[PDB]
Ligand binder design. Structure first.
Ligand SMILES: [Mg+2]
Ligand SMILES: [Mg+2]
Lengths: 84, 101, 132, 138, 229
């Protein structure tokens, strides 16, 4: 009648109150970090389950137009103003 | 791999005309007004005349993209009357039917 | 005499499909259009580029599935999507169909820069509307 | 029995920016087939009623463009073939919508636009006078 | 032996603390994965590692529990410890939406269902499946061979331990939409129909068997004929 979570623990690692305050975002990821992030996208990889899911995938990849239709999607003429 | 040598000559003309369009527009504007001095307008007359002949847009011909027929082409589809009818009569052009009224 | 798209009478032994049996004056009366897009509507653009694409696709599918197609293609365009509906025969092995569907959908998507789907419908034999 | 237990609903975040107000939306749909416009109208009107949108439908007059071509490949000028393209219309007039409501309705009905049907959506937006026009500077 | 290996591992953890290096989730998952060779010696130590994770604040992922149940579930008839672990793990994981954290997150559900079949507990199996169906947890089922194993063990336990009327509902929902049955699962379904005295369905099972590629399976053909006669 004893829960597995209650009992003796290894006290080598002290209780970390918080994580690292600032990560090295500017530093580019190494090949190991990139490849490890690709393995975490495979555990969650499943085949498309219906038509809606295929449309959702295409939209995320940029293959399918985003609705409602905007005829100027992806075209901002150099961010120019009307007065220029 | 174009339909014939005639189509190939029109392809080159459309390409050369595209490359020179801005230069031709700029020089032609100098000539198409009464504001600038005639001495300057005469030099512009010579300059636009010295450009390659195949840059002149009037030399482009709207040939059928499928058969190269230079006449009887419908501009909306860029097809000769014969090719258009072949596709239309087989029901392969969306919304085009035989007209009776 | 008119000739356009008229399968002419034989001895009563030539099987024709429903599309091949109807002459051009039936295209909005008894048979529909084999392609549906917006190019040919009033005030719409790019009818020419849609036409060339349709002609290529019908040639591509005829040679990519040699001897399999049982009738003409039905090309559908909705927004950015292109959907090819083909009635094929039940002679080629299913493995070869799946290979060719994956190959044609990928190759055509990269050629015309749009999502392309191929919807196959199999029939035991060519559907005969009448014997001319 | 094999039914999903819980469902992740898509996150809709209420912003702190005010919404757009559309006085009218004019959804003009063009097609070559009248029955396809009939079905689309029924769908569009039902969707509007279920979402609480005021909708009125009318049918603008059809446009028939006709043109003539030669019958034979060579000579025989007197003999022609005449083709036409029929453009039929249906106009859905929505009223008193907000930017969010219009965005949802338009995405829903535009995604379900049947092959061979085009749409032109005219949006009338209600705006207030520019700040610079409240009084003259001179 | 384990004791020496355990001392070595603990020494590295002490080196990690000395160098001011904070352990990540993978640090503990590798320990548990490594502790699987020592079948019965690492059970209590492995639980200590899990208890340490929760205290530090590292949240066990699906991979963490996968390694634990694999360690605790070795070929033993009692499965007394395994019984307690799985029940406690399922209570903790109830109604938890998971996100990919470790490459082995996809191996949990197949291992959880395999233990439910060994314990022959249908209520536990329904809890495991319940977890799979909440939110987007269904995407952790894994590759095809994982998905087939999970559903084979799950449907075989339903046929054995549940009323025939509910078994047939699970049969219709799962096959063919979720998986294609193995010839042995059709035999289990035929045996369940026999126990329930519902032999009017045997002709339908034969039709379905032929549609699922078991027309020429000798074992299946002999079972159907014997039951009918
Ligand atoms: Mg000319
Ligand atoms: Mg005549």
């Amino acid at each position: 009648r004893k829960n597995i979570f209650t009992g003796k623990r290894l006290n080598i690692f002290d209780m970390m109150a918080v994580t690292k305050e600032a990560p090295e975002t500017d530093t580019s990821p190494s090949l190991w970090d990139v490849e490890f992030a690709k393995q975490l996208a495979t555990v969650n990889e499943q085949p498309l389950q219906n038509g809606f899911e295929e449309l959702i995938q295409w939209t995320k990849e940029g293959k399918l137009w985003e609705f409602p239709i905007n005829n100027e999607a992806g075209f901002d003429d150099d961010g120019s103003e009307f007065h220029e | 791999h174009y339909v014939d040598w005639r189509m190939w000559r029109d392809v080159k003309r459309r390409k050369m005309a595209y490359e020179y369009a801005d230069e031709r527009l700029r020089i032609n504007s100098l000539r198409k007004n009464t504001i600038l001095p005639k001495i300057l307008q005469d030099v512009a007359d010579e300059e636009i005349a010295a450009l390659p002949r195949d840059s002149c847009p009037v030399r482009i011909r709207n040939r059928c993209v499928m058969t190269s027929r230079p006449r009887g082409v419908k501009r909306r589809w860029r097809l000769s009357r014969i090719v258009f009818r072949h596709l239309a009569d087989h029901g392969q052009l969306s919304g085009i039917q035989r007209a009776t009224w | 005499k008119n000739r356009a798209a008229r399968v002419r009478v034989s001895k009563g032994d030539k099987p024709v499909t429903y599309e091949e049996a109807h002459a051009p004056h039936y295209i909005a009366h008894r048979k529909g259009w084999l392609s549906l897009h917006t190019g040919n509507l009033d005030g719409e653009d790019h009818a020419a580029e849609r036409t060339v694409e349709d002609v290529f696709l019908r040639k591509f599918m005829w040679g990519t599935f040699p001897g399999c197609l049982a009738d003409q293609l039905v090309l559908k365009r909705r927004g950015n999507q292109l959907e090819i509906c083909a009635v094929v025969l039940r002679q080629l092995s299913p493995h070869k169909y799946y290979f060719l569907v994956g190959y044609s959908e990928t190759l055509l998507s990269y050629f015309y820069k749009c999502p392309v789907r191929l919807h196959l419908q199999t029939v035991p034999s060519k559907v005969v509307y009448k014997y001319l | 029995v094999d039914v999903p237990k819980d469902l992740t609903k898509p996150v809709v975040t209420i912003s702190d920016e005010p919404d757009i107000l559309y006085k009218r939306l004019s959804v003009l749909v063009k097609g070559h087939d009248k029955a396809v416009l009939d079905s689309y109208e029924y769908f569009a009107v039902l969707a509007a009623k279920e979402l609480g949108i005021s909708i009125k439908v009318h049918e603008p007059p059809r446009k028939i463009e006709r043109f003539t071509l030669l019958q034979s490949v060579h000579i025989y000028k007197k003999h022609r073939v005449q083709y036409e393209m029929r453009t039929l219309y249906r106009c859905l007039e929505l009223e008193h919508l907000t930017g969010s409501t219009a965005d949802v309705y338009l995405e829903y009905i535009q995604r379900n636009l049947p092959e061979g049907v085009a749409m032109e959506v005219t949006k009338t937006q209600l705006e207030q006078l520019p700040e610079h026009i409240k009084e003259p500077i001179w | 032996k384990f004791e020496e290996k355990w001392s070595k591992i603990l020494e590295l953890l002490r080196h990690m603390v000395a160098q001011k290096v904070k352990p990540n989730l993978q640090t503990f998952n590798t320990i548990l994965k490594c502790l699987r060779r020592f079948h019965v010696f690492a059970r209590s130590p492995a639980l200590q590692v899990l208890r340490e994770m929760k205290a530090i604040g590292i949240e066990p992922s699906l991979a963490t529990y996968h390694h634990i149940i694999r360690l605790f579930d070795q070929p033993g008839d009692p499965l007394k410890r395994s019984s307690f672990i799985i029940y406690d793990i399922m209570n903790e994981l109830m109604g938890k939406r998971f996100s990919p954290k470790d490459p082995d997150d996809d191996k949990f559900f197949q291992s959880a269902m395999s233990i439910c079949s060994s314990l022959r507990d249908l209520e536990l199996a329904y809890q495991v499946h319940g977890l799979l169906k909440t939110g987007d947890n269904w995407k952790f089922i894994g590759p095809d061979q994982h998905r087939n194993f999970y559903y084979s063990k799950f449907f075989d336990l339903i046929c054995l331990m549940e009323q025939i009327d509910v078994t047939l509902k699970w049969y219709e929902d799962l096959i063919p939409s979720a998986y294609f049955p193995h010839s042995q699962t059709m035999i289990h379904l035929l045996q369940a129909l026999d126990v329930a005295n519902r032999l009017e369905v045997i002709p339908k099972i034969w039709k379905d068997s032929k549609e699922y590629g078991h027309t020429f399976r000798s074992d299946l053909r002999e079972e159907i004929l014997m039951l009918m006669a």
